[PDB]
Design a protein around this ligand. Structure first.
Ligand SMILES: COC1=C(OC)C(=O)C(C/C=C(\C)CC/C=C(\C)CC/C=C(\C)CC/C=C(\C)CC/C=C(\C)CC/C=C(\C)CC/C=C(\C)CC/C=C(\C)CC/C=C(\C)CCC=C(C)C)=C(C)C1=O
Ligand SMILES: CCCCCCCCCCCCCCCCCC(=O)OC[C@H](COP(=O)([O-])OCC[N+](C)(C)C)OC(=O)CCCCCCCCCCCCCCCCC
Ligand code: SF4
Ligand code: SF4
Ligand code: SF4
Lengths: 59, 376, 158, 127, 181, 90, 323, 192
C-alpha cells in the first residue's frame, strides 16, 4: 500500500486532467446545446447556420 | 579566458570549452592542525587525526598510533591488532562507499547515494556501539584500543557482511555496464605510471595505472600478512578502472573483515605496561600504583624517546603518512601530515588537461579530495 | 486592536507560519566534517524531504543557511558574500562546534571563533559531529522558532 | 487525537504504525510507548506517541524512557522509575530554549540573569 | 596515436569474430538492455519497503557508551561526586572546561566554579574516562540545541541539574559500561 | 478558420495569469552554436517539406514518393558531409 | 462568454496538476531511493505544494538591476505563455478540444520551436556570463532534439492521413500505433526527455556541477514560473506521447467492460504512466555531458528518425495500406 | 478592425527594428513582426503558411540571428549614427514609393464601397474541403517536383558554404574514446 501512497499524488494529476477536460466539455455543451464536433469544416458550418436559421424561422 | 568557481575554489583556463589548465585554491579549510598538535599532548592530539580525512576516520588513528608505537617501542596485543584491522577495513568500506556515491551524484546518478548511506548508517552504528560516537571515534590509541568490543558486535558484523556482499553486487549491477556511466568514466583523466610516480600518487590513484604496489603488502603493519586478500590493479589508469578497483577493494575489505571475525583471539585490548597505557577503572580505584599511573597519564603523557620517524599506512584514499619528531618531552615537537589528497589535487592540473568541465568534476570525484586532509 | 480583527490576524499569521515552516529550503555550507553527517541527515533514514527540507544549491532560492564545518579566515568573506545574497526571510543554523565557538580549533590562527562573528546565526546545534538525529532536532527547532512569527500582527500594529 | 492527522501527516504515519502494535507502557507525562515485533524492520519496532498532538517535541521523552526508546536498554521506563534516586533529583523539563528569558538558562554574569554576579577577584578599599 | 589506432583495430577484430556476436552486440546497444535492467532494479526498490526512521516518534539506535551532553553526577547520599582534582581540563584536548575551587565549610574539597563550553567541547569523553570518581559523565542526551551561544555556555549548576535529571539513565549506562572496563 | 479565436483568448488569459503570479509577492567566440543553428534551419526546412508530403501520400503516387526520396538523398549527402567534416562533433 | 470559462478551467487545473506533479516526482524518487518523500506537510504531503507556493509568494523579491529589467522579467512569462497555449489544443476525449485545428501537429511543433526564446532571453538578460552560456547550451540541445521530435511527428503523420490530434486518435482506434512503432515511441520519449531538460540530458538542473544554468540569477517568482513552464511542458509532451503512440482516449481491446470508463480517465491514466516513466528515468540513470548529448542527438536520433520515416513511407506506399 | 490592429502592430515592430539601438531588441521586434505577419496569414486563411512562418522564420532564422547577435556582443558607438541627417532622403524615397503605390492602386485594384446576403454558396466544392496543406502538398510533390528538388541543391550549397566558412577543428586537443578494452571486455586483474 506504500506504492499506493506514493502514486496518490499522480492520481491528483489524473483527476486534474479529467476535471479540465470534462469541465470544458460540459461548459461547451451548455453554451451550444450539443457536444462539440471535431470533424467540422465549411460544409458543417454552413449546415449548422442553415439549421439555426430554419429552426428560428419555424419557431 | 579564466573561469572561476567558488570548500572548493578552482580557476580554469578555457579556449573552446576545453580545459587548458586548472588551478585549485585550497587554503579555505586550513586550521593550524600541526601547530595545535605541537601545542598539545599525544593523547590530546589523537582527535586531530580523527578530524583529518574525516571520511576515513580510524585509518588516521591507526597511522598515528603506529608512529607513536614506533617511536615508543610498545607491543600491541593480538586481539587489539585484529580489532584494529577489522575497524580499519570497515573504515575503508565506508570511505569507498562515500567516494563512489558522491562521484556518481556528481556524474548525475542520484539513487545509489541513499542505498550506500543505509550501508554507511549500519557501519556508523557499528562505530557507535563499539566506541563513543558515530564519527570521530577516538577508539584506536597508542598501545592498543580504548575499549573492548561489546558482545554481539561480531554477529552483527557478519550479518552486515552478507547483506553488503548483496549490496555491492547490487551497486555494481546498476553502475557498471551502464552506457552513460562508461561514457562518463572511460578515457577520462588517464594517468601513466610514470606520471603517477612523478606526482606522488598513492592508493587507487597509483594502482589505477598498474604500478602493482600496495602498502598492506609492501610493509605489512598488522596481521595483514596473515589475511591472504587480493589487491586489484588497473590495466589502463582512468576513472573507470579506478572505480572498478574501488569496487574490488570493497569486496576484499569484506573478505578481510570476515577473516578477522573468524580468527580474532581472546586476550587484552591494549599494551600491558601501565607506563604507556592507562589502567582500568577498577585497577585505578583499587591499586595505589595504578592510581598514580592513571593520574600521571591523564595529566602528563608518555614521554617518547627523542627521535624522528615517518610512519605510513594504506588509507582508503591512499598512503597516509605521519612524520613525528620528538624531543623526549610529553608533547610532539613536530608532526607533519602527508595526506593522499595533497598530491592528487596537484595531479588535477595535468589530469584535467584538454578535458571539459564535466570531466573536471569527474576527475575530482575519482580522486576523492577531502579538503580537511589536504588542508591539514 | 479589536477581538475579531485580532482573531483574523492570528489566523493569517498561523497560515503564514505554517507555510514558512513546511517549506523550508535550506542551503548547505558544507565545510570540514559536519557536512558528511549532514549528508547522512539527508539520507534515507533520517530523511529531510518529509518535513519540506530540500537543499537548494543557489543561495538566491534558499531559505536558511546551514553552516556545517570549520569557518576559516580565508572562507569567512565567502560565507558572508553568499549569506548577503539570500532573501530577506532568512535563518541560520550553526551545526557542530567549529561553527559555534571555534570548536577543537578555537586557539588557532585562520579559524573564525564561530560563525556568529560573520553572520547572525539563529540556532546552534551542539555536537562534534552532532548526530543526524540532533541536526534534524535543530531543524525542527527552527520550525518551532519560525512557528511564532507574528509578522502580520506586527505590521498591523505599527 | 485523530483530527490532527489531516494537517499533520506525521501523526498519520504514527497512527498507521500503531495498527498491530502493543502498548508496552505509558509515562507520567502522558507519552504512550509502543513496541511492535514480528515482521517489522529493526529500526522501527519501538516508538512513542507524545499525547501532545499540537506541539509534540523530541525532548519530551523522560530519561526513564529515553534509553528504551533509543534502544540503549531493554529496561522499560517503569524499572528506571523504580530505580530513580532519592534524597536529590529534579523532574524532567523539556528543551524550551526560546520559550522565554525567564525559562531559558542564563549565566551568572549575563545581564538577563535575575542575580548578576561581578567578577574581579579583588576587593576594593570601599571607603 | 598510431598505437591507439592499431589497438582499436585489433579489438574490433577480436569482438567481431562472427555475425552472431556482432548482431548480438548491435541489438544490445540498440535496445537498451542495461537501461532496462537498471529500470527493473529501480522498480523493485520502488515496490520494496522503506527504511525511513519517522524521526520525532521513532529514534535511531544508540549505545550506552554514547558521548552526548556533558553532565555532573552526585553520590547516592546527595553530596557532589566531583572532588576538585582538575583532571577534566588537564586532559580536555579542546580546553573547554574551566574549574576553580576552594575548601568548603566542613573542610571538604569541592569545586566553587565548574563551567564547560558546549561550543568548544568536541564530545570525546576524555574527561568522563579521566574522572577518578565517575563524577563527570557524557550523558545520553543529545537533543539540546539552543538558540543562543550564551545558553550553550554551561556552568556547574546546569551540569548538576542535568546529572540529577538524567541520573537513572546515566547510572544504567555507567553500570553497563563499568562491566566493559 | 474560426478556431484560432479561442487560441487568442487563451493567450490573453495566460498573460493575465502570468502577470498576476508575478505581482503576488509585490502585494506583500564559438562556431559550434552557429553550426547547430544552420543545421536547425536546414532540418526545419526538411520537416516543413515532409508535412505536406506525409499528409498527401495517398494522392501523390510513386512519382511523389520517389521525388521526396530524391530530395532526401540530395540532402542526406549533405548530412554525410556534416558527419565526415566534423560539424556534428563538439 | 463560455470561452474564457473553458480557458480558465484548462489553465487552473493544469497548475494544480503541475504542483502535484512535482510532489509526485519527489514521492516516486524517494520511494525509489528507499525513503519517503514529503509526508509532514499534510496527510501524505498533499499540502506540500500549497505550502511551497505560499512560501514562494511570501518571500520578499529582489531586483537584480541588470539594465535589462523588462527582458529579465518577461522571459519566464514567455515560456509560461508557450506552455499554456501548447496545452490549449491537446484533446482529452471525443470533443474536448478548444481549438480543433486541422493543423494541430504543426501548431504544437511551432509552439515547441518558440520555447527556446524564454531561456535564451533569460540567459542573455542576466548579468553573469555563465547563465548566458548555459542558456545557449540548453537552447541548442532543445533545437537538436526538437528536430528529432519533428521527424517523429512526420512518421506519425505518414501513418495517419490527417494532421489534427482528434482524427489522429480516431485512426489510433485500431492498433494504437505503439505496437507498430514501439522504437519510434522510444525515440520520441528520449527526444522529449531531452526537449524539456529532464532525466538524462539535464544541464540546467546540474547546478551542483560546473555547467550551472540559466536560472541562477532569477528571483523567487521568475524561478517559480520557469519551473512551472518546464513541468507543464513535461505533462504536455507526456500527453503528446500518449496521443501519438498510445491512442489517447481509447480503451484496450474494445471490450464492453472497458468502455464503461469514460475515456478521459484512459487519457489521464496513460499520461500518468508517462509521467511515472519520466520520474523513473530521471531517478534510475546518470546524466550525459553536453557534447555527448549533442552528438547523440545529431548522430543517433536524427538518422534513425529519417530511416524510420523512410521505412514507414515505404511500407505504406507499397501495400494498399494508405489512408 | 482586427486586421488594422495587426498591421499597426506590425508597422510599429518594423519601425522598432529599423530604429532600435540594440541589435538584440532588433531581433526581438523582428520576431514580433513575424508573429504579426503570421496573424495576418490566419486572417487570410493560410494556416499552414502561418505555422511554417512561425517554425522557420520565428524558430530557425530568428534563433540564428539571436545567437549571432548576442555572441557578437556589439557595443554602442561601434554601431551608432544620427538619423536626423538621413530623414529628408528617407522621406523623399518613401514618398516616391508611396506615390507609386498610389498609382498602382488607382488603376488595377479598386476598393469596394458598401453584400453578405449576395454571397452565392456553391455547396459543390464543400463536400470534401481540401486544406491548404493538402493542396500544397499534392501540387508541390506531383506536378512541380523540379522547383522542389532545386531548393535541395540550394540547402546543400548553404550547408557546404557554412562548413567551408565556419569550421575550425581543434589542432591539439584530446578526444575521449569509449571503445577501449576496459570498456569492452574488462578482464579482471590482481596484484598477486
Ligand atoms: C524542487 O524544488 C522546488 C519545489 O519543491 C517541490 C517547489 O515547490 C517549487 C514551486 C512549485 C510550485 C508548484 C509553486 C506554485 C504553487 C501553486 C499552488 C501553483 C499556483 C496555482 C494556482 C494559482 C491555481 C489556483 C486557482 C484557484 C484555486 C481558483 C479556483 C477558481 C474556481 C474554483 C472557479 C472560480 C471561483 C519550485 C520552483 C522548486 O524548484
Ligand atoms: C523494418 C523495420 C524493423 C525495425 C526493427 C527494430 C529496430 C530498432 C532500431 C532502432 C531502435 C530505436 C530505439 C532505441 C534508440 O533510440 O537507441 C538509440 C541509442 C542507442 O545507441 P547509443 O547512443 O546508446 O550508443 C552509444 C553511442 N554510439 C552510437 C557511439 C555507440 O540509445 C541511447 O542513446 C539511449 C539514451 C538514454 C535513454 C534513457 C531513457 C531510456 C528509457 C527506457 C528505454 C527502454
Ligand atoms: S564541530 Fe567537530 S565534527 Fe563538526 S566540523 Fe568541527 S571537528 Fe568536524
Ligand atoms: S568530552 Fe572531551 S572535549 Fe568534551 S569536555 Fe570532556 S574532555 Fe573536553
Ligand atoms: S575528573 Fe571528575 S572529580 Fe576531577 S574535576 Fe573532573 S568531574 Fe571533578
Amino acid at each position: 500500500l506504500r506504492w499506493m501512497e506514493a502514486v496518490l499524488p499522480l492520481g491528483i494529476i489524473a483527476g486534474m486532467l479529467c476535471v479540465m477536460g470534462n469541465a470544458q466539455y460540459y461548459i461547451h455543451k451548455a453554451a451550444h446545446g450539443r457536444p462539440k464536433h471535431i470533424g467540422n469544416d465549411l460544409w458543417d458550418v454552413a449546415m449548422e447556420r442553415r439549421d439555426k436559421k430554419l429552426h428560428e424561422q419555424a419557431a | 579566458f579564466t573561469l572561476n568557481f567558488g570548500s572548493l575554489r578552482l580557476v580554469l583556463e578555457m579556449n573552446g570549452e576545453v580545459v587548458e589548465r586548472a588551478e585549485p585554491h585550497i587554503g579555505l579549510l586550513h586550521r593550524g592542525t600541526e601547530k595545535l598538535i605541537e601545542y598539545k599532548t599525544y593523547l590530546q592530539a589523537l582527535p586531530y587525526f580523527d578530524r583529518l580525512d574525516y571520511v576515513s576516520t580510524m585509518a588516521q588513528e591507526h597511522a598515528y598510533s603506529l608512529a607513536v608505537e614506533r617511536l615508543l617501542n610498545c607491543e600491541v596485543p593480538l586481539r587489539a591488532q585484529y580489532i584494529r584491522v577489522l575497524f580499519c577495513e570497515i573504515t575503508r568500506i565506508l570511505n569507498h562507499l562515500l567516494a563512489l556515491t558522491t562521484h556518481a551524484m556528481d556524474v548525475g546518478a542520484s539513487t545509489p547515494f541513499l542505498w550506500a548511506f543505509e550501508e554507511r548508517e549500519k557501519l556508523l552504528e557499528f562505530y557507535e556501539r563499539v566506541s563513543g560516537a558515530r564519527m570521530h571515534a577516538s577508539f584506536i590509541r597508542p598501545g592498543g584500543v580504548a575499549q573492548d568490543l561489546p558482545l554481539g558486535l561480531c554477529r552483527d558484523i557478519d550479518s552486515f557482511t552478507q547483506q553488503f556482499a548483496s549490496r555491492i553486487d547490487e551497486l555494481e549491477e546498476m553502475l557498471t555496464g551502464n552506457r552513460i556511466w562508461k561514457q562518463r568514466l572511460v578515457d577520462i583523466g588517464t594517468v601513466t605510471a610514470q606520471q603517477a610516480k612523478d606526482w606522488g600518487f598513492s592508493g587507487v590513484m597509483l594502482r589505477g595505472p598498474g604500478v602493482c604496489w600496495d602498502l598492506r603488502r609492501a610493509a605489512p603493519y598488522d596481521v595483514y600478512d596473515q589475511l591472504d586478500f587480493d589487491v586489484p590493479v588497473g590495466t589502463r589508469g582512468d576513472c573507470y578502472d579506478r572505480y572498478c578497483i574501488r569496487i574490488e577493494e570493497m569486496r576484499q575489505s569484506m573478505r578481510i573483515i570476515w577473516q578477522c571475525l573468524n580468527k580474532i583471539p581472546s586476550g587484552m585490548i591494549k599494551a600491558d605496561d601501565r607506563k604507556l597505557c592507562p589502567p582500568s577503572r577498577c585497577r585505578m580505584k583499587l591499586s595505589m600504583e595504578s592510581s598514580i599511573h592513571h593520574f600521571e597519564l591523564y595529566t602528563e603523557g608518555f614521554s617518547v624517546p627523542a627521535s624522528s620517524t615517518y610512519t605510513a599506512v594504506e588509507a582508503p584514499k591512499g598512503e597516509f603518512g605521519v612524520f613525528l619528531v620528538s624531543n623526549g618531552s610529553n608533547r610532539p615537537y613536530r608532526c607533519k601530515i602527508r595526506a593522499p589528497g595533497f598530491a592528487h589535487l596537484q595531479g588535477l592540473d595535468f589530469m584535467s588537461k584538454h578535458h571539459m568541465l564535466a570531466d573536471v568534476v569527474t576527475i575530482i570525484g575519482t580522486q576523492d579530495i577531502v579538503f580537511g586532509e589536504v588542508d591539514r | 486592536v479589536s477581538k475579531a480583527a485580532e482573531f483574523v490576524i492570528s489566523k493569517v499569521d498561523d497560515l503564514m507560519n505554517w507555510a514558512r515552516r513546511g517549506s523550508i529550503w535550506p542551503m548547505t555550507f558544507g565545510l570540514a566534517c559536519c557536512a558528511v553527517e549532514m549528508m547522512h541527515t539527508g539520507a534515507a533514514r533520517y530523511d529531510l524531504d518529509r518535513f519540506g527540507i530540500i537543499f537548494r544549491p543557489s543561495p538566491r532560492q534558499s531559505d536558511c543557511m546551514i553552516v556545517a564545518g570549520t569557518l576559516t579566515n580565508k572562507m569567512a568573506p565567502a560565507l558572508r558574500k553568499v549569506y548577503d545574497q539570500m532573501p530577506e526571510p532568512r535563518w541560520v543554523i550553526s551545526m557542530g562546534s567549529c561553527a559555534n565557538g571555534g570548536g577543537y580549533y578555537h586557539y588557532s590562527y585562520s579559524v573564525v571563533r564561530g560563525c556568529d562573528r560573520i553572520v547572525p546565526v539563529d540556532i546552534y546545534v551542539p555536537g562534534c559531529p552532532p548526530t543526524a538525529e540532533a541536526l534534524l532536532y535543530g531543524l525542527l527547532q527552527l520550525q518551532k522558532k519560525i512557528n511564532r512569527r507574528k509578522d502580520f500582527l506586527h505590521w498591523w500594529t505599527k | 487525537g485523530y483530527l490532527r492527522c489531516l494537517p499533520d501527516g506525521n501523526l498519520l504515519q504514527t497512527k498507521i504504525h500503531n495498527i498491530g502494535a502493543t502498548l508496552v507502557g505509558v509515562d507520567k507525562f502522558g507519552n504512550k510507548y509502543y513496541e511492535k515485533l514480528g515482521d517489522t524492520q529493526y529500526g522501527r519496532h519501538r516508538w512513542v506517541e507524545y499525547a501532545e498532538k499540537s506541539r509534540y517535541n523530541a525532548s519530551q521523552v523522560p530519561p526513564e524512557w529515553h534509553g528504551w526508546l533509543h534502544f540503549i536498554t531493554d529496561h522499560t521506563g517503569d524499572e528506571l522509575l523504580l530505580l530513580k534516586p532519592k534524597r536529590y533529583g529534579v523532574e524532567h523539563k523539556e528543551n524550551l530554549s526560546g520559550e522565554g528569558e525567564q525559562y531559558i538558562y542564563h549565566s551568572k554574569g549575563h545581564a538577563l540573569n535575575p542575580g548578576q554576579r561581578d567578577w574581579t577577584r579583588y576587593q576594593p578599599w570601599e571607603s | 596515436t598510431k598505437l591507439e589506432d592499431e589497438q582499436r583495430e585489433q579489438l574490433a577484430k577480436e569482438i567481431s569474430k562472427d555475425w552472431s556476436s556482432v548482431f548480438e552486440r548491435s541489438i544490445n546497444t540498440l535496445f537498451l538492455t542495461e537501461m532496462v535492467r537498471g529500470l527493473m532494479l529501480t522498480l523493485k526498490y520502488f515496490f520494496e519497503t522503506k527504511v525511513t526512521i519517522n524521526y520525532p516518534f521513532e529514534k535511531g539506535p544508540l549505545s550506552p557508551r554514547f558521548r552526548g551532553e556533558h553532565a555532573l553526577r552526585r553520590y547516592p547520599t546527595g553530596e557532589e561526586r566531583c572532588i576538585a582534582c582538575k583532571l577534566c581540563e588537564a586532559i580536555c584536548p579542546a580546553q573547554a572546561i574551566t574549574i576553580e575551587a576552594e575548601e568548603r565549610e566542613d573542610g571538604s574539597r569541592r569545586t566553587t566554579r565548574y563551567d564547560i563550553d558546549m561550543t568548544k567541547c568536541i564530545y570525546c569523553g576524555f574527561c568522563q574516562e579521566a574522572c577518578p570518581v565517575d563524577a563527570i559523565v557524557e550523558g545520553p542526551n543529545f537533543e539540546f540545541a539552543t538558540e543562543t551561544h550564551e545558553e550553550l555556555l554551561y556552568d556547574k549548576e546546569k551540569l548538576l541539574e542535568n546529572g540529577d535529571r538524567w541520573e537513572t539513565e546515566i547510572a544504567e549506562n555507567l553500570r553497563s559500561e563499568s562491566l566493559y572496563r | 478558420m474560426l478556431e484560432f479565436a479561442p487560441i487568442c483568448i487563451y493567450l490573453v488569459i495566460s498573460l493575465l495569469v502570468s502577470l498576476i503570479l508575478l505581482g503576488l509577492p509585490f502585494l506583500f567566440f564559438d562556431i559550434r552554436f552557429y553550426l547547430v543553428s544552420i543545421l536547425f534551419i536546414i532540418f526545419d526546412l526538411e520537416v516543413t517539406f515532409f508535412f505536406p508530403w506525409a499528409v498527401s501520400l495517398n494522392k501523390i503516387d510513386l512519382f511523389g514518393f520517389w521525388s521526396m526520396m530524391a530530395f532526401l538523398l540530395i540532402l542526406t549527402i549533405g548530412f554525410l558531409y556534416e558527419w565526415k567534416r566534423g560539424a556534428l562533433d563538439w | 462568454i463560455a470561452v474564457p470559462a473553458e480557458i480558465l478551467g484548462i489553465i487552473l487545473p493544469l497548475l494544480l496538476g503541475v504542483a502535484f506533479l512535482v510532489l509526485a516526482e519527489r514521492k516516486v524518487m524517494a520511494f525509489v531511493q528507499r525513503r519517503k518523500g514529503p509526508d509532514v506537510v499534510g496527510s501524505f504531503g498533499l499540502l506540500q505544494p500549497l505550502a511551497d507556493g505560499l512560501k514562494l509568494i511570501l518571500k520578499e523579491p529582489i531586483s537584480p538591476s541588470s539594465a535589462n529589467f523588462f527582458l529579465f522579467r518577461m522571459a519566464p512569462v514567455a515560456t509560461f505563455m508557450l506552455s499554456l497555449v501548447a496545452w490549449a489544443v491537446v484533446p482529452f476525449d471525443y470533443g474536448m478540444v478548444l481549438s480543433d485545428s486541422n493543423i494541430g501537429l504543426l501548431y504544437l511543433f511551432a509552439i515547441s520551436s518558440l520555447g527556446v526564446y524564454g531561456i535564451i532571453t533569460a540567459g542573455w538578460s542576466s548579468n553573469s556570463k555563465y547563465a548566458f552560456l548555459g542558456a545557449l547550451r540548453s537552447a541548442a540541445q532543445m533545437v537538436s532534439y526538437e528536430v528529432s521530435i519533428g521527424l517523429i511527428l512526420i512518421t506519425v503523420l505518414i501513418c495517419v492521413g490527417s494532421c489534427n490530434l482528434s482524427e489522429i486518435v480516431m485512426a489510433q482506434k485500431q492498433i494504437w500505433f505503439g505496437i507498430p512503432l514501439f522504437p519510434v515511441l522510444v525515440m520520441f520519449f528520449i527526444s522529449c526527455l531531452a526537449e524539456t531538460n529532464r532525466a538524462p540530458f539535464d544541464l540546467p538542473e546540474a547546478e551542483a556541477e560546473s555547467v550551472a544554468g540559466y536560472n541562477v540569477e532569477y528571483s523567487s517568482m521568475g524561478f517559480a514560473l520557469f519551473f512551472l513552464g518546464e513541468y507543464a511542458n513535461m505533462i504536455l509532451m507526456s500527453g503528446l506521447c500518449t496521443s501519438l503512440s498510445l491512442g489517447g482516449w481509447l480503451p484496450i481491446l474494445d471490450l464492453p467492460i472497458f468502455k464503461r470508463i469514460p475515456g478521459s480517465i484512459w487519457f489521464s491514466i496513460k499520461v500518468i504512466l508517462f509521467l511515472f516513466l519520466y520520474i523513473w528515468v530521471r531517478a534510475a540513470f546518470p546524466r550525459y555531458r553536453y557534447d555527448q548529448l549533442m552528438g547523440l542527438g545529431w548522430k543517433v536520433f536524427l538518422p534513425l528518425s529519417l530511416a524510420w520515416v523512410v521505412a514507414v513511407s515505404g511500407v505504406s506506399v507499397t501495400f494498399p495500406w494508405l489512408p | 478592425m482586427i486586421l488594422s490592429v495587426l498591421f499597426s502592430l506590425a508597422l510599429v515592430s518594423g519601425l522598432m527594428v529599423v530604429r532600435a539601438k540594440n541589435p538584440v531588441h532588433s531581433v526581438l521586434f523582428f520576431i514580433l513582426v513575424f508573429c504579426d505577419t503570421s496573424g495576418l496569414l490566419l486572417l487570410l486563411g493560410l494556416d499552414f503558411f502561418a505555422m511554417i512562418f512561425l517554425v522557420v522564420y520565428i524558430g530557425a532564422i530568428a534563433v540564428l540571428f539571436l545567437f549571432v547577435v548576442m555572441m557578437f556582443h556589439i557595443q554602442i558607438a561601434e554601431i551608432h549614427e544620427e538619423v536626423l541627417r538621413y530623414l529628408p532622403v528617407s522621406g523623399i524615397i518613401g514618398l516616391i514609393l508611396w506615390w507609386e503605390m498610389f498609382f498602382i492602386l488607382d488603376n488595377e485594384t479598386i476598393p469596394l464601397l458598401p453584400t453578405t446576403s449576395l454571397i452565392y454558396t456553391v455547396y459543390a466544392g464543400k463536400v470534401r474541403s481540401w486544406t491548404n496543406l493538402e493542396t500544397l502538398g499534392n501540387l508541390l510533390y506531383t506536378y512541380y517536383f523540379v522547383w522542389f528538388l532545386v531548393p535541395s541543391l540550394i540547402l546543400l550549397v548553404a550547408m557546404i558554404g557554412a562548413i567551408v566558412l565556419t569550421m575550425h577543428r581543434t589542432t591539439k586537443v584530446k578526444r575521449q574514446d569509449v571503445f577501449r578494452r576496459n570498456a569492452i571486455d574488462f578482464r579482471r586483474t590482481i596484484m598477486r
